[PDB]
Design an enzyme around this catalytic site. Sequence first.
Site, short mmCIF file in Angstrom:
data_model
loop_
_atom_site.label_atom_id
_atom_site.label_comp_id
_atom_site.label_asym_id
_atom_site.label_seq_id
_atom_site.Cartn_x
_atom_site.Cartn_y
_atom_site.Cartn_z
N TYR A 60 8.56 -14.29 -0.26
CA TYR A 60 7.59 -13.68 -1.13
C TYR A 60 7.95 -13.02 -2.33
O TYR A 60 7.21 -12.81 -3.41
CB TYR A 60 7.24 -12.42 -0.16
CG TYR A 60 6.37 -12.97 0.86
CD1 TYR A 60 7.13 -13.22 1.73
CD2 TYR A 60 5.26 -13.24 0.91
CE1 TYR A 60 6.68 -13.84 2.99
CE2 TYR A 60 4.72 -14.10 2.08
CZ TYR A 60 5.38 -14.37 3.05
OH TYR A 60 4.90 -14.98 4.30
N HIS A 93 1.60 -12.09 -5.61
CA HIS A 93 1.25 -10.34 -4.79
C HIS A 93 2.35 -9.62 -5.33
O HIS A 93 2.16 -8.22 -4.90
CB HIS A 93 0.85 -10.80 -3.50
CG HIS A 93 -0.23 -10.00 -2.85
ND1 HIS A 93 -1.34 -9.19 -3.59
CD2 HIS A 93 -0.27 -9.68 -1.74
CE1 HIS A 93 -1.96 -8.40 -2.54
NE2 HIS A 93 -1.31 -8.77 -1.56
N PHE A 126 4.19 -4.70 5.25
CA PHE A 126 3.21 -5.35 4.83
C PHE A 126 2.47 -4.89 3.66
O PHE A 126 2.27 -3.62 3.60
CB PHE A 126 2.14 -5.80 6.18
CG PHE A 126 2.64 -6.46 7.31
CD1 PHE A 126 2.82 -7.84 7.26
CD2 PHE A 126 2.93 -5.83 8.36
CE1 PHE A 126 3.27 -8.57 8.16
CE2 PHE A 126 3.36 -6.57 9.61
CZ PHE A 126 3.18 -7.96 9.33
N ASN A 172 -0.56 -4.59 3.21
CA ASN A 172 -1.68 -3.63 3.47
C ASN A 172 -1.35 -2.41 4.12
O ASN A 172 -2.39 -1.62 4.60
CB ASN A 172 -2.75 -4.52 4.57
CG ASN A 172 -2.24 -4.82 5.76
OD1 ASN A 172 -0.82 -5.56 5.78
ND2 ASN A 172 -2.64 -4.54 6.90
N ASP A 197 -0.21 -6.48 -8.91
CA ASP A 197 -1.01 -7.71 -9.39
C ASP A 197 -2.38 -7.27 -9.53
O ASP A 197 -3.02 -6.71 -8.72
CB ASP A 197 -0.76 -8.74 -8.21
CG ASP A 197 -1.02 -8.19 -7.11
OD1 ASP A 197 -0.53 -7.21 -6.42
OD2 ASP A 197 -1.62 -9.26 -6.22
N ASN A 235 -5.38 -5.06 -1.11
CA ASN A 235 -4.90 -4.47 0.14
C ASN A 235 -4.00 -3.30 0.07
O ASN A 235 -4.11 -2.36 1.02
CB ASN A 235 -4.45 -5.50 1.18
CG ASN A 235 -5.26 -6.52 1.86
OD1 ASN A 235 -6.42 -6.34 1.97
ND2 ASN A 235 -4.77 -7.60 1.79
#
Length: 196
Positions: A18, A23, A69, A71, A96, A117
């Site tokens: 990631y 994101h 995460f 979220n 972002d 999120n």
Amino acid sequence: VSQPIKLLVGLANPGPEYAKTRHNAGAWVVEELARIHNVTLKNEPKFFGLTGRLLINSQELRVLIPTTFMNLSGKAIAALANFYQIKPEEIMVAHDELDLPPGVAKFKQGGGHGGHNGLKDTISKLGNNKEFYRLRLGIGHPGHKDKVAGYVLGKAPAKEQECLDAAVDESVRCLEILMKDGLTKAQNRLHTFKAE
């Protein structure tokens, strides 16, 4: 003197694959600021995130990159903010931003989450308080509702990534100006920037 920010959070999804997805743009800001200031970020599982403390123009600035995460980003931010007694209005959350193009970045005070999120969870964990600042790192928009998630979780092509990295750099310069000259001056500079 006055500048309201005591904590800068760079929103992220965790782990090596990631690192360079769109994101994670907020996390890029925080890592670069931290690097320039020689702070090694430390994993603190009690705060669900990587943390540090920078001194900039004699102001203490805490930084945080959650390892939740995206979220569940509020788990981290509320844990660290509670521990240090930082009010929502003293937090700036880098993230972002679909609604700005690659190469552009803006500061903002309060506002909604925009379907993000991370922002959404942040608001809920801070007591439905939207009034934190944001640093909105433009990623562009794919202009199809159903394409949004895959776009945000994707990797920009190399050329676009240069525009992104340039906005990261300028956002860092403006956070520094934030700490020295205050928000109006930082914002006047950042908001005229567009990368080539």
